[PDB]
């Protein structure tokens, strides 16, 4: 099995896990076009007999009694001689689908509606930090659901994923700082998770039981189960979970204005069950997290812009206090250095180029200054990778991964190189998984050990992107209160001319 | 209309409204303490004879069968021969209470909770800022209730009332931007509003039926009903609610980190009944609005401050471009006004006074510059009421009600000042509904006048308080960010004179 997954569609496997039982109705007859293989236990007749019979006869009276209310709402309690069963309606490909789920034996009088929502929303009374908000949400989710581990992901612009918050019981390895490639999650999976809020993987050991028409004749395709919540997982992802060691999963999809921002993944080692009320409350909890994250991301970006301005401001205090600027940058290296979130600065101002922080060598920076002139840059230049644009520094990686340049003078070549380290260097290596387990897995698919490589070779020779705040600060320092720099140059020159006349 | 209102104890009034009935119990013997006058219809036997009787025969057998069940939830729906009835239990004064309320005929099986919650949440998908958050929330709450006029109230630091947004159908009076003094909400009422989220006005027309006995013997005062949601309101508020003509109200409280930031008070001209599914939905909606309101408030700042810091930047571009400071302010007189959110600005860099915007004449400016030097302020002087701090300028405070002054020179007396207009002038006088009412009110207890008239005299010689961002910008103006850029003009002039007369 090679090159599998992305080619394979995931909405048309035609398989159902043994958790529930589904049937397909169509037309006034509501014929049993598609039936399950496990319906023998509940219906009491062989599935092939069920085929080609009217829905009124086949359905037990318990389900038929509240069928109108079931269509009105889509969820109500029906008690069978075996026991009570959750019932739902979902329309796919023009055919209605009746879904039956084994409800718990609990009387359900306890854990009433809307009180779990209060229990979940109470701890979030504070929650300043976006990362700390995700941490608190993970804590509450773990407290309610009882799963071993809760992890929260953020998706990068190119759909690279990382882990932000992690709430877990003591004992298992921490997964904070994880980075996994965008290709780990296929496009169709992202679309499906966008469409439906919750995904439940009841048990990994369970062998899927397929519905038993081979192919739908009228459609020519297996029945689509995208809306249905009983979709069977892909075998590749099943082996993923088997290698990782998690068997029951409960995944929540965080959406910011229709964009899949990240996922909450509740993981447990053994198959567990969750009540219907808890899941219904968790859907609302997902909506709350979506809204709160949508607001707080804007809050954090505004705060970062304000801090960038309030950091660029004091730089005018040093230059203007009397001390020469070339000594001033050495005096105040940190503030000028962190105006863009970069690690190296190099300045051309008329004299020999000056270096602050980790910067490329003298020959390298002068060659870069020579090379930058022919390209017409109206105000500034933004680049993500330097190897493609500039061959000579492609070999250099540790001080040549990122570049940001602004020309201080419109005519004269005044170059302000800003180098930001490679994404793999700026991110703490404490974020890697490490902790090598003794058993040897396939090492190609599973995340433990045999992963995090695709990230490092996909983003190799690439630095973290220059945010809107980063380029705004780049322009601001292209000025750097351009009055102070231009007027100190002019003032020094015009005092020097008077001194030379006095000379 | 007697003996004012502040001394009146709301907590201890112990009144029972028209619809529901109450009865108290003590200990395992559950001695009956108090009864309502209207319970005889529901109980079927005279209330006076049951004083101190056992619950076995006073109360119908069905409630006693569900007493242990009612204790768990604290509220339950039960079928009674008269009809469905809804009962509650809670603790007050060491004495347990049983409350009975008329019940809606719906068995709470159709359109249950946790599916209208998403109906309320979905419109909030946008709401880029606080104002539209409140607008959308008010609109959707109005849609849920079906009431006539929803309203939102905001309180200042000194508890003065604001009206941010409202949603109304066509054909009534609007009070957007209308103002009410802090004393309109008694200090007794604020703590109670903090304690419980929801309070419902059952019927304004119906007089409060008395509670029997008139007073409990053991305590000497009627038992309080803070936990109860049926507690009757003051007779003083009956005249108010009659004057505005509303019949029922449904008060929703918005608390941020334990403080009454806002208050939602729906109004309906005629009586209307709301089910507890809706009530338990809107209490969740208040808990909802709390967090998102905090988030949007916290996001609004650090963006206004960022814009002010960025706004100060082009003032530097006014320099370097050919011209002096006088000419720089001549072309750019607009931008310097919003640097501190003040309509007038004055500067004194050593020469004759120069003014921008509507500021006091130069003689009083010189007088205040002379007077501020004896007053010890190291970096800035932020006074909200000028007359209290400085008598002579109290006479003309239309534009000099509030001032922010900074010393340009470190030791010498060089000043930069900003003058804000007095309040009421800045606010949009839209609080008047126009259309003087054909009925004649007392002009002291109604929406227009009485309220917003005591408020105006309460905030005479007052301006919006100097926040953090405007003073930060003001101190940045004097700080070595643009002040040094101003100083460099002196060195440029010095080099010009060095070139002058010597060539
Ligand atoms: C060629 C594509 C795939 C290779 C790569 C592979 O191993 N699986 C592929 C496709 C699918 N991924 C599905 C679900 C899924 N996989 C991940 C990957 C992870 N990266 C990590 O660090 C961790 C945790 C340690 C994981 C699990 C994720 C995040 C997901 C989303 C759901 C989940 O978290 O389990 C998948 C099934 C569809 C779906 O459930 O979305 C296919 C097919
Ligand atoms: C000190 C006595 C009072 C006079 C003064 C008065 O006008 N109100 C007094 C005390 C109480 N006010 C109560 C309710 C209430 N009052 C307001 C303020 C307003 N100012 C206005 O101009 C308008 C008209 C639009 C109003 C409504 C508000 C906002 C409220 C709460 C709204 C509500 O009833 O839900 C009151 C009873 C408290 C209660 O149970 O609500 C007292 C006592």
PDB file of C-alpha atoms and ligand atoms in Angstrom, chain A residues 3-10 13 149 151 153 155 161-163 175 178-190 192-193 199 201 231-241 244 246 249-251 263-267 444-448 451-452, ligand 1:
ATOM      1  CA  UNK A   3       0.633   6.582  -2.376  1.00  0.00           C
ATOM      2  CA  UNK A   4      -2.707   5.910  -0.668  1.00  0.00           C
ATOM      3  CA  UNK A   5      -5.039   8.344   1.173  1.00  0.00           C
ATOM      4  CA  UNK A   6      -5.391  11.635  -0.716  1.00  0.00           C
ATOM      5  CA  UNK A   7      -6.456   9.768  -3.860  1.00  0.00           C
ATOM      6  CA  UNK A   8      -8.996   7.751  -1.866  1.00  0.00           C
ATOM      7  CA  UNK A   9     -12.304   9.540  -1.186  1.00  0.00           C
ATOM      8  CA  UNK A  10     -13.471   9.325   2.413  1.00  0.00           C
ATOM      9  CA  UNK A  13     -16.333   3.974   1.808  1.00  0.00           C
ATOM     10  CA  UNK A 149      -5.752  13.365  27.081  1.00  0.00           C
ATOM     11  CA  UNK A 151      -5.045  18.317  22.764  1.00  0.00           C
ATOM     12  CA  UNK A 153      -4.320  22.271  17.388  1.00  0.00           C
ATOM     13  CA  UNK A 155      -3.553  25.313  11.558  1.00  0.00           C
ATOM     14  CA  UNK A 161      -0.594  22.106  12.186  1.00  0.00           C
ATOM     15  CA  UNK A 162       0.854  22.639  15.641  1.00  0.00           C
ATOM     16  CA  UNK A 163      -0.240  21.960  19.220  1.00  0.00           C
ATOM     17  CA  UNK A 175       2.807  16.498  23.197  1.00  0.00           C
ATOM     18  CA  UNK A 178       4.101  19.245  18.143  1.00  0.00           C
ATOM     19  CA  UNK A 179       4.413  20.118  14.460  1.00  0.00           C
ATOM     20  CA  UNK A 180       2.901  18.000  11.694  1.00  0.00           C
ATOM     21  CA  UNK A 181       2.687  18.619   7.939  1.00  0.00           C
ATOM     22  CA  UNK A 182      -0.381  19.819   6.079  1.00  0.00           C
ATOM     23  CA  UNK A 183      -0.489  16.633   3.983  1.00  0.00           C
ATOM     24  CA  UNK A 184      -1.085  14.604   7.162  1.00  0.00           C
ATOM     25  CA  UNK A 185      -4.724  15.764   7.024  1.00  0.00           C
ATOM     26  CA  UNK A 186      -6.233  15.444   3.515  1.00  0.00           C
ATOM     27  CA  UNK A 187      -8.300  18.153   1.859  1.00  0.00           C
ATOM     28  CA  UNK A 188     -11.502  16.101   1.951  1.00  0.00           C
ATOM     29  CA  UNK A 189     -11.045  15.495   5.681  1.00  0.00           C
ATOM     30  CA  UNK A 190     -10.739  19.245   6.249  1.00  0.00           C
ATOM     31  CA  UNK A 192     -15.849  17.172   6.078  1.00  0.00           C
ATOM     32  CA  UNK A 193     -14.724  18.457   9.480  1.00  0.00           C
ATOM     33  CA  UNK A 199     -16.699  13.417  15.120  1.00  0.00           C
ATOM     34  CA  UNK A 201     -14.698   7.229  16.868  1.00  0.00           C
ATOM     35  CA  UNK A 231     -18.970   6.937   9.148  1.00  0.00           C
ATOM     36  CA  UNK A 232     -16.302   4.246   9.183  1.00  0.00           C
ATOM     37  CA  UNK A 233     -12.745   5.538   9.420  1.00  0.00           C
ATOM     38  CA  UNK A 234     -10.212   5.047   6.661  1.00  0.00           C
ATOM     39  CA  UNK A 235      -7.966   2.003   7.219  1.00  0.00           C
ATOM     40  CA  UNK A 236      -4.896   4.255   7.121  1.00  0.00           C
ATOM     41  CA  UNK A 237      -6.203   6.392   9.980  1.00  0.00           C
ATOM     42  CA  UNK A 238      -7.276   3.246  11.833  1.00  0.00           C
ATOM     43  CA  UNK A 239      -3.694   1.972  11.672  1.00  0.00           C
ATOM     44  CA  UNK A 240      -2.573   5.468  12.696  1.00  0.00           C
ATOM     45  CA  UNK A 241      -4.605   5.163  15.896  1.00  0.00           C
ATOM     46  CA  UNK A 244      -0.384   5.590  18.447  1.00  0.00           C
ATOM     47  CA  UNK A 246      -5.610   5.601  21.197  1.00  0.00           C
ATOM     48  CA  UNK A 249     -11.752   9.488  19.996  1.00  0.00           C
ATOM     49  CA  UNK A 250     -14.046  12.510  20.348  1.00  0.00           C
ATOM     50  CA  UNK A 251     -12.966  15.374  18.086  1.00  0.00           C
ATOM     51  CA  UNK A 263      -9.220  20.874  16.404  1.00  0.00           C
ATOM     52  CA  UNK A 264      -9.754  19.581  19.938  1.00  0.00           C
ATOM     53  CA  UNK A 265      -8.943  15.863  20.119  1.00  0.00           C
ATOM     54  CA  UNK A 266     -10.080  13.919  23.177  1.00  0.00           C
ATOM     55  CA  UNK A 267      -8.087  10.680  23.345  1.00  0.00           C
ATOM     56  CA  UNK A 444       6.538   5.841   8.265  1.00  0.00           C
ATOM     57  CA  UNK A 445       2.913   6.642   9.127  1.00  0.00           C
ATOM     58  CA  UNK A 446       2.477   7.126  12.881  1.00  0.00           C
ATOM     59  CA  UNK A 447       3.293  10.430  14.576  1.00  0.00           C
ATOM     60  CA  UNK A 448       5.398   8.935  17.423  1.00  0.00           C
ATOM     61  CA  UNK A 451       7.034  12.020  12.020  1.00  0.00           C
ATOM     62  CA  UNK A 452       7.989  15.706  12.336  1.00  0.00           C
TER      63      UNK A 452
HETATM   64  C1  LIG C   1      -1.797  10.579   3.044  1.00  0.00           C
HETATM   65  C2  LIG C   1      -2.565  11.173   4.180  1.00  0.00           C
HETATM   66  C3  LIG C   1      -2.543  10.592   5.357  1.00  0.00           C
HETATM   67  C4  LIG C   1      -1.294  10.006   6.005  1.00  0.00           C
HETATM   68  C5  LIG C   1      -0.265  11.117   6.211  1.00  0.00           C
HETATM   69  C6  LIG C   1      -1.697   9.448   7.331  1.00  0.00           C
HETATM   70  O1  LIG C   1      -0.985   8.913   8.110  1.00  0.00           O
HETATM   71  N1  LIG C   1      -3.207   9.693   7.494  1.00  0.00           N
HETATM   72  C7  LIG C   1      -3.727  10.415   6.242  1.00  0.00           C
HETATM   73  C8  LIG C   1      -4.958  10.799   5.996  1.00  0.00           C
HETATM   74  C9  LIG C   1      -5.982  10.913   7.117  1.00  0.00           C
HETATM   75  N2  LIG C   1      -5.779  11.636   8.398  1.00  0.00           N
HETATM   76  C10 LIG C   1      -7.042  11.501   9.217  1.00  0.00           C
HETATM   77  C11 LIG C   1      -7.277  11.996  10.416  1.00  0.00           C
HETATM   78  C12 LIG C   1      -6.186  12.767  11.156  1.00  0.00           C
HETATM   79  N3  LIG C   1      -4.861  12.503  11.102  1.00  0.00           N
HETATM   80  C13 LIG C   1      -4.217  13.397  11.887  1.00  0.00           C
HETATM   81  C14 LIG C   1      -2.700  13.434  12.086  1.00  0.00           C
HETATM   82  C15 LIG C   1      -2.099  13.637  13.240  1.00  0.00           C
HETATM   83  N4  LIG C   1      -0.797  14.427  13.428  1.00  0.00           N
HETATM   84  C16 LIG C   1      -0.458  14.410  14.924  1.00  0.00           C
HETATM   85  O2  LIG C   1       0.473  14.918  15.452  1.00  0.00           O
HETATM   86  C17 LIG C   1      -1.542  13.623  15.571  1.00  0.00           C
HETATM   87  C18 LIG C   1      -1.631  13.335  17.065  1.00  0.00           C
HETATM   88  C19 LIG C   1      -0.587  12.866  17.709  1.00  0.00           C
HETATM   89  C20 LIG C   1      -2.487  13.174  14.610  1.00  0.00           C
HETATM   90  C21 LIG C   1      -3.717  12.339  14.972  1.00  0.00           C
HETATM   91  C22 LIG C   1      -5.162  14.233  12.438  1.00  0.00           C
HETATM   92  C23 LIG C   1      -4.908  15.402  13.393  1.00  0.00           C
HETATM   93  C24 LIG C   1      -6.372  13.839  11.993  1.00  0.00           C
HETATM   94  C25 LIG C   1      -7.713  14.489  12.342  1.00  0.00           C
HETATM   95  C26 LIG C   1      -8.558  13.593  13.250  1.00  0.00           C
HETATM   96  C27 LIG C   1      -7.751  13.134  14.463  1.00  0.00           C
HETATM   97  O3  LIG C   1      -7.165  13.980  15.187  1.00  0.00           O
HETATM   98  O4  LIG C   1      -7.677  11.908  14.741  1.00  0.00           O
HETATM   99  C28 LIG C   1      -8.002  10.670   8.365  1.00  0.00           C
HETATM  100  C29 LIG C   1      -9.418  10.272   8.774  1.00  0.00           C
HETATM  101  C30 LIG C   1     -10.362  11.426   8.465  1.00  0.00           C
HETATM  102  C31 LIG C   1     -10.550  12.269   9.723  1.00  0.00           C
HETATM  103  O5  LIG C   1     -10.840  11.715  10.815  1.00  0.00           O
HETATM  104  O6  LIG C   1     -10.408  13.518   9.669  1.00  0.00           O
HETATM  105  C32 LIG C   1      -7.348  10.325   7.096  1.00  0.00           C
HETATM  106  C33 LIG C   1      -7.959   9.502   5.960  1.00  0.00           C
END
